Design a protein around this ligand. Structure first.
Ligand code: NFU
Ligand code: SF4
Ligand code: SF4
Ligand SMILES: [Cl-]
Ligand SMILES: [Mg+2]
Lengths: 598, 270
């Protein structure tokens, strides 16, 4: 047992293992210890996959790198390609044309919306929603609930809900439950009424149909989804209005606009209101657990500048907050060797000296799969993992030695802090947050006949509910932003600027004989960076530090815990053999394990 | 009774699972609710840990020799297989266990079919395609990174309707989707045929949709349905949106030189 970061870790209690953790991307094992009252008092995050993309990149052409690293992840598809082209452009001093900038932004914001909305409905919802309780809902009362939760949503009649209910009823009564097989339905961890459950299941099915429409924006600009194409120096989708034979013409741009307008409607009428309503009801039950490191330490690189290449105009302004002090945002520099560093003290890698953290320009990825002396089981049949030694394929990123949480919640806390110090670019996230707090505290309770509460944003945001909320709000904001980007793109094209690629430094004969660069992206799950060194036209070193690397990290040399482990601490489980609360909180980070390990 | 599908995940990026749910005809929603019984799938399933693992035993017993094994990703052989761990054990052990009573095996995507990105040199995990580990079972390869959504649901639809694996070419790919090269029906062919090429990105030729061969397009040596069926309900494909085909459905495409280096012997493809 030891104390770190205000947490008292203790492994004396009953050990519980969740392997596999499902409804995530990739492979994770989670272990906890619970005390005599089923409260979590220790948590262990294990990344159970590795591919070695950083190793595979060595010796290859920097212009090709985006395609390799894009395949780090098919869920956050394209965010690695963006980081890569940005990193190479940074190394080679390439400025991309305005249209390439705007098209990349539109693609990035499309990913944000698709990733967030799919995550909530298809991966997260089943931790809050009991699908079997939806069978017992009254269709009329579900319609009435729908009209309170989201008056403007047109799909709200009693017959529509009854039809959805009957299809679910038939599916269940077949005895082949499929994805609902062996679920935790009926657990006292579930608090929603039948009507809310049926509403949520209906939206699950709606989102599953709609999500395939949104990604057609990627298909237009990048050819396909998943894994759209990118380009060092700009975008491949050349522009011409006055042929049918250009990748981008006005008809293609009008099609993109129609998809954007659909996204805006979905975020405002379905996604945000569902999360506010579900969040309100779990708040009423007192389920404010899962804050973890969000209560103290948060980080983002900052993204979406109003003016290209001008970081002061970031519309999700970044930096770092420490010790819960929201009145002070420290600037974050991905080039500073004393800021972002990765340890492997408790990871399955080797450094010369594992008492130190390496900045990614000096990063090393040498596998070292070895288990500690306290392991129960064998090298190929683990029963209980030994967290005192090496226990994960995820490295341990730290910022000036501090453990940080990243993601939409971090960005929204940063945006709120920036707004209160006078940053006007953060005004919309601030507005979203204040609106959300008033809905959760007053409007929704009053509409449902529940008592009103008086939680501040400081109290509400650092929680599993807050983390889930921030994701939904970010989706909405991203939709709104790409609507403006579209208008800027069309305006720029109509004013006569059709440029999509700067090819001045395409040929490696024009390059400096050595160079280094960094590209950062506000990926759906948080702060992403790619750091490249180039020598004689080839990749000398390529290191990625990915959002789930931050959040899912094992302990560092000092024994400080990462965001997943901290967030599970001090949470009661109704039944320690049913991991409902573990899954609810882990899923609130939207863990991407292939990303985390690459 | 809907046919059970046990969908395993090895080393992967999850692009295959994502592509699957983009299907317009049929909807993935209709596939899961009305066509198959998707009884195990790490990305969507409600159960976790011990409750998830117990499903495999139940389905294999009750539907012995009558469930489909779908595999996304691949098993690593290095690190004693523990560069991909499931339930504390190597993934290769899970794969071998579930494969033994399967009536058919689908290798989804280039990872399962051939190895894909993690198998590119120097392959630090010795990631190995499914057919090199499972040698005594009927396998269908559906390559591509990822494959087209309608190709994936097309294969499922065929298998469920007919209770048969469709006719395969000698590489194990279904002829109904992988019989044509991209270059056969690519809409830029008339430019290729007239020697009209993009030489630099965003040149006048690129704005007219000229052929991408000299920019590295690997369509002349790549078998897939992208030029005709296209992507995301027939919206576009790599070439239509301006980037050459990188050859993502072909075995070992990551190690066939730079994506922007042209194929040699252009007369070959006329
Ligand atoms: N968002 C996201 Fe990926 Ni699949 C993570 N973690 C990021 O770069
Ligand atoms: S016609 Fe063949 S090389 Fe030109 S598939 Fe590649 S762009 Fe079409
Ligand atoms: S890289 Fe694009 S056109 Fe070639 S998706 Fe079709 S075979 Fe892969
Ligand atoms: Cl391959
Ligand atoms: Mg890394």
């Amino acid at each position: 047992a030891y104390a770190t970061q205000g947490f008292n870790l203790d492994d004396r209690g009953r050990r519980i293992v969740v392997d596999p953790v499902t409804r995530i991307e990739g492979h994770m094992r989670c272990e906890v210890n619970v005390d005599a009252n089923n409260v979590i008092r220790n948590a262990v995050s294990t990344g159970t996959m590795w591919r070695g993309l950083e190793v595979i990149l060595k010796g290859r052409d920097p212009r090709d790198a985006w395609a390799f690293v894009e395949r780090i992840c098919g869920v956050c598809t394209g965010c690695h390609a963006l980081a890569s082209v940005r990193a190479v452009e940074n190394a080679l001093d390439i400025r991309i044309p305005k249209n390439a900038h705007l098209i990349r932004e539109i693609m990035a914001k499309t990913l944000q919306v698709h990733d967030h909305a799919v995550h909530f409905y298809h991966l997260h919802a089943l931790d809050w929603v009991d699908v079997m309780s939806a069978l017992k809902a009254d269709p009329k009362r579900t319609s009435e609930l729908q009209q309170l939760v989201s008056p403007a949503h047109p799909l709200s009649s009693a017959g529509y809900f009854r039809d959805i209910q009957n299809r679910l009823k038939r599916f269940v009564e077949s005895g082949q439950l499929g994805p609902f097989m062996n679920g935790y339905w009926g657990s006292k961890a579930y608090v929603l009424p039948p009507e809310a459950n049926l509403m949520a299941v209906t939206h699950y099915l709606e989102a599953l149909d709609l999500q395939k429409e949104w990604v057609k924006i990627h298909t237009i600009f990048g050819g396909k989804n998943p894994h759209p194409n990118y380009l060092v120096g700009g975008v491949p989708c050349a522009i011409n209005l006055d042929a049918a034979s250009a990748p981008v013409n006005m008809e293609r741009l009008s099609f993109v606009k129609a998809r954007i307008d659909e996204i805006i409607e979905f975020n405002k009428n379905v996604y945000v209101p569902d999360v506010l309503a579900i969040g309100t009801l779990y708040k009423q039950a007192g389920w404010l657990y899962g804050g973890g490191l969000a209560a103290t330490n948060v980080l983002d690189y900052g993204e979406y500048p109003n003016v290209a290449y001008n970081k002061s105009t970031d519309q999700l302004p970044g930096g770092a907050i420490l010790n819960g002090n929201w009145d002070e945002v420290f600037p974050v520099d991905p080039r500073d060797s004393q800021q972002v560093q990765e340890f492997v003290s408790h990871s399955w890698y080797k450094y010369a000296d594992e008492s130190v953290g390496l900045h990614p320009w000096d990063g090393v990825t040498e596998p070292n799969y070895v288990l500690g002396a306290n392991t129960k089981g064998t090298r190929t049949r683990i029963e209980q993992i030994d967290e005192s030694a090496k226990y994960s394929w995820i490295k341990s990123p730290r910022w000036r030695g501090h453990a940080m949480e990243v993601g939409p919640l971090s960005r929204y806390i940063l945006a709120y802090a920036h707004a209160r110090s006078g940053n006007k670019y953060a005004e919309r996230p601030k507005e979203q947050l204040e609106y959300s707090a008033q809905m959760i505290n007053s409007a929704i309770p009053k509409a449902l006949g529940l008592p009103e509460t008086q939680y501040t944003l400081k109290q509400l945001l650092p929680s599993t509910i807050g983390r889930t909320l921030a994701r939904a709000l970010e989706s909405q904001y991203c939709g709104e932003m790409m609507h403006s980007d579209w208008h800027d793109l069309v305006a720029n094209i109509r004013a006569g600027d059709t440029a999509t690629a700067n090819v001045d430094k395409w040929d490696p004969a024009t390059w400096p004989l050595q160079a280094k660069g960094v590209g950062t992206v506000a990926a759906p799950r948080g702060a992403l960076g790619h750091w490249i060194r180039i020598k004689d036209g080839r990749i000398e070193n390529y290191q990625c530090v990915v959002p789930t690397t931050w959040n899912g990290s094992p302990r560092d040399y000092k024994g400080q815990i990462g965001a997943f482990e901290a967030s599970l601490m001090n949470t009661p489980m109704v039944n320690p053999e049913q991991p409902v609360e573990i899954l609810r909180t882990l899923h609130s980070f939207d863990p991407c394990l292939a990303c985390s390990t690459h | 009774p809907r046919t059970p599908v046990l969908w395993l995940h090895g080393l992967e990026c999850t692009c295959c699972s994502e592509s699957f749910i983009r299907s317009a005809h049929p909807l993935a929603k209709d596939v899961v609710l009305s066509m198959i019984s998707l009884d195990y799938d790490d990305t969507l399933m409600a159960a976790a840990g011990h409750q998830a693992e117990a499903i495999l035993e139940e389905i294999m017993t009750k539907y012995k020799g009558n469930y489909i094994l779908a595999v996304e990703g691949n098993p690593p052989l290095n690190q004693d297989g523990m560069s991909c761990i499931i339930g504390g054990r190597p993934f290769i052990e899970q794969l071998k266990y579930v494969a033994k009573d399967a009536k058919a095996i689908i290798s989804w995507g280039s990872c399962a079919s051939w190895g894909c990105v993690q198998a590119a040199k120097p392959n630090p995990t010795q990631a190995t395609p499914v057919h090199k580990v499972i040698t005594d079972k009927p396998i269908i390869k559906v390559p591509g990174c990822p494959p087209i959504a309608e190709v994936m649901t097309g294969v499922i639809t065929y298998m469920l309707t007919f209770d048969r694996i469709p006719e395969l070419d000698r590489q194990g790919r279904p002829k109904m989707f992988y019989s044509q090269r991209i270059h056969d029906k690519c809409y830029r062919r008339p430019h290729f045929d007239a020697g009209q090429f993009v030489e630099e990105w965003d040149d006048e030729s690129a704005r007219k949709g000229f052929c991408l061969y000299k920019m590295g397009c690997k369509g002349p040596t790549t078998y897939n349905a992208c030029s005709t069926t296209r992507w995301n309900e027939g919206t576009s494909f790599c070439i239509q949106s301006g980037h050459g085909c990188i050859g993502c459905s072909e075995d070992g495409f990551w190690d066939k030189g730079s994506f922007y280096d042209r194929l040699t012997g252009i007369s070959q493809f006329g």
